[PDB]
Amino acid sequence: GLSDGEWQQVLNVWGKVEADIAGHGQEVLIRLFTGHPETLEKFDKFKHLKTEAEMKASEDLKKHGTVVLTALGGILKKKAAHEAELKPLAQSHATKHKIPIKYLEFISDAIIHVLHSKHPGDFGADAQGAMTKALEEFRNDIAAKYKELGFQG
């Protein structure tokens, strides 16, 4: 994972991308298609683009560059926001509290039990299945940070 420092360097340069997303997107795609021509073969809608000049002239290649970098920016920002809340919790539970993954499993089971007990009408089999998967994914995310910190959970 990225530290707060590394995410800050990523988000700082992404601010420059957002000042001209279409220009950056066009340049990225032309760099990709000129360096690795097999990648252009994946775009049926760009079959008419046969030279770097034709690529530069394409309205729809520039529009697609905007689609790509807009989607990537969103995913980078949402990943950083998740990391900013997960990392401090994994740090303390690895290093200070020393909480095994087995104990995170026990509290996950307790949350499911209390939700079923307090919300039987609402928290039905499908919703309980959804929460079981969400808490498993949470434990796996902590376990990956544990392995990085050298803490055997």
- The token pair at 114 is 């209390």
Would you give the binding string for ligand HEM spanning residues 89-108, x where CB under 6 A is met?
x--xx---x-x---xx--x-
The binder of a copy of itself chosen from 18, 54, 109, 148 (CB under 8 A): 109
Which distant-in-sequence residues (6+ apart) come within 8 Å of 135 by Cβ? Answer: 108, 111, 112
- List the one residue out of 57, 60, 70 whose CA is nearest residue 21: 70
Tell the residue number behind the tokens 């376990």, with chain if given: 143
d(CA 86, CA 113): 24
Known binding positions for heme b: 93
Tell me which residue has tokens 């009408």. Answer: 121
Determine the interface stretch with a copy of itself among 50-58, 80-88, 145-153 (rule: CB under 8 A).
Answer: 80-88
Is 42 near ligand HEM (CB under 6 A)? yes
User: Which stretches within 1-58 are classed as H helix?
Assistant: 4-18, 21-35, 52-57
139 binds, among a copy of itself, ligand HEM, none (CB under 5 to 8 A by kind): none
Task: For a copy of itself, give the closer residue by CB, 50 or 82.
Answer: 82
Single out the residue of 133, 113, 136 nearest to residue 123, CA to CA: 113
CA distance 15 to 51: 31
Q: Does 67 engage in binding with a copy of itself (CB under 8 A)?
A: no
67 binds, among a copy of itself, ligand HEM, none (CB under 5 to 8 A by kind): ligand HEM
Binding site for a copy of itself (CB under 8 A): 1-2, 5-7, 9-10, 12-13, 16-17, 23-24, 27-29, 31-32, 35-36, 39, 42, 68-69, 71-72, 74-76, 78-79, 81-82, 84-86, 89, 97-99, 103, 106-107, 109-111, 113-115, 117-119, 122-123, 126-127, 129-131, 133-134, 137-138, 141
